[PDB]
Amino acid sequence: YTRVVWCAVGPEEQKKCQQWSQQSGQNVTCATASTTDDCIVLVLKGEADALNLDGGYIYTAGKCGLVPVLAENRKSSKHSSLDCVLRPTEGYLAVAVVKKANEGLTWNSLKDKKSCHTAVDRTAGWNIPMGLIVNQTGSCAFDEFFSQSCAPGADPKSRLCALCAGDDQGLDKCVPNSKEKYYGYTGAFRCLAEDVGDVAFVKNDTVWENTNGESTADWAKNLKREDFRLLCLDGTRKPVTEAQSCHLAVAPNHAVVSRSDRAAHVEQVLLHQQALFGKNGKNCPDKFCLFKSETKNLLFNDNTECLAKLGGRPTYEEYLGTEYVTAIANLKKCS
Template sequence: MRLAVCSVLCAGALGLCLDVPEKTVRWCTISSHEANKCYSFRDNMNNVLSVEGPHVTCVERTSYLECIKAIVANKADAVTIDGGLVFEAGLAPYNLKPVVAEFYGSKDDPQTHHYVVAVVKKGSDFQLNQLQGKKSCHTGLGWSPGWNIPIGILLPSDLVEKAAAKFFADSCVPCADQTAFPKLCQLCAGKGTDKCACNSHEPYFGYSGAFKCLQDSVGDVSFVRHMTVFGGLKENLFQIHFIQKGEADAMSLDGGFIYTAGKCGLVPVLAENYLSQDGKEQLGSKCVNTPVEGYYVVAVVKKSDADLTWDSLRGKKSCHTAVGTSAGWNIPMGFIYNQTGSCKFDEFFSQSCAPGSDPASSLCALCNGSGTPAHTCAPNSHEGYYGSSGALRCLVEKGDVAFVKYPTVLRNTDGKNPEAWAKDLKQEDFQLLCLDGTRKPVTEAQSCHLAIAPSHAVVSRKDKADFVRRMLFNQQELFGRNGFEYMMFQLFKSSSKDLLFSDDTECLTNLQDRTTYQKYLGPEYLHAIANMRQCLHSELLDACTFHGN
């Protein structure tokens, strides 16, 4: 089965839109996330193009149909929509035209199509011709992969909505009329008027939403495009896969993911050298050639929980940077595994936030997803408790212990972080748990830490390593902490936390002779990873290990 092209619609050809006197394209968005990206796109266009334009402005609507109507009414100019809606928008009374197609596939094999697939969980005991009476998850009413194609094949009827409501036990079909067809919205997760909504206010809307409906075991089958399934890979593993395939060249990774990247044939290129614990530069011009020393992994608790020690963590609520990371997972859970001999970490702690875990498990019970259910427990910045600062926030708001890199507490207390959750925090409100059962102030990590973890490092393919190294050194000279263009852009500063690189990076430094993942990570860390290997399931790591990298 093939999916129609996902296209951009405009009131005329895009060239005609750009020929209007104001040279402005009004882009239509259907959610706050889309709008924010559009505003960022607009601002960056203004920065790089001359005042003559062309320019982009952003128009907010609540659904793709509303965007189509806005274009017809000359209140917007363009929107990106699914192929099924391209067909509808081309009919009267809209009469709009597709002008640009999204390319998929790879650079060597570009494609303007993708495949429609019916996805089920492994172990399901039914076939495609046995879907009647099952619970179904759909991207949206009128979408090619989620509705038009599968329903057209299963139910060749003019009254498809009525027929689908009878064919499936229950469904989530965002954009459907839940008054007329309540069964088509029965499985949707939106609250109140957002239930079955035609935008991201409905958690099961769109490709990732329909797949999440299946992941959450709400539905038995999900109709999506084939690439959606690969989007289910943990984010860093997905990016490693892209670098391995040659569709990307480099990224900065935590030590745990450097291990996976190394098994997949990638090599470390440069390492992050960190600022001093008070947030000041300590190496200056010597930074790029100073060997990296790694960072302390610490267990942080509230000073007010005076009876909590390393030996009394069972049954407590835990906060982790993400599954697979050194500070938040591999090292602390490695110690716990050595104590218990069990990988059932969800039974050791009562509740946790460990981004990257199964959203339905207790390991995600504390996560907040930035208020959006679809992002809950995601191993990226969409999850508010992701990363070291996120894990500390989790501790402040919900948890008993946070496993983070040092000096996370120092960077987020005493006014150093103006965000609402952190602005009133005091350094003395927290303490470190030591492995010997004692507790110490957060400034004494040197004598009270779980381990020293390798610094984050940039990885690439061997054939690109030299080029990536030269490029990053060049960009560091421009946008590093002492760069010539530092005021224009800060390489090691993020609007959120730790985007692209860790925010406490002083510079990217040479690796000396540590240019393989084994040499970079060192024997102690490799031993720790080996102990945890049976508790970590990674399809990418399994595949790369099988192929002998």
């Protein structure tokens, strides 16, 4: 067998990967890049084997030949006798969240407001809301829709990065990795919690996981669910308990990708690594927990229960689903 070389995006993920690599006796080792696209390039060159990706990045990786290997599976809404690794994945709900105190903000009054996005090219933070907005406005000018935004990955001098804050020192503003204070699901929800933006494009779980004491982090520790609303597409506002009926889309779960020729080896190594370090793993919490990172969703989402086998050896188009692939392709016609 061979070692599997994981790709970590940014220095926080690198730190976690190095701990995993130490704990796994170098069965896993780490390459690191500054952005998820750069990690996808390391994997295409064969200088890393694999990483776990949002669906929008699975699209970029899959057009370049990489394939899905195992998917994140979080706690499921319905009981099941099935082992987590054999349970079919239930996507997540992309939502638009605002503060309840920002009265009269709805889907239909988003123009000229301030927005918080996980990063350009991600499912809930960008592809689903910007795809809907281009469609509804009949215009590709999505870069002038919101007055200002934090959309990590966009041009840092542009209005799409004006709300981004970078790192402690204020460097790396708008970079699409965990150093940008408003990156990712928890960064974009923080951008709304702090009232830097009027709306955040995240998923349902983000709201729940960072409110009502679910997070002990300083910016989150006082947030109350009842102070947030979701924006529904018919122009109504609902409590965040109502995401099943007030979402923008259902997104395919994040998943691990690799080159075809290393997919079977990556899959075998990962099933053994989660047996050691996953939820109820032999060495978690004592030694190392692969699906924890103090809410920061480093390498994998912290709500992951396991990585699960995929049905039907799917292509990346089959894993994303034709509807979503066609929505992304439409959106990318713009730029």
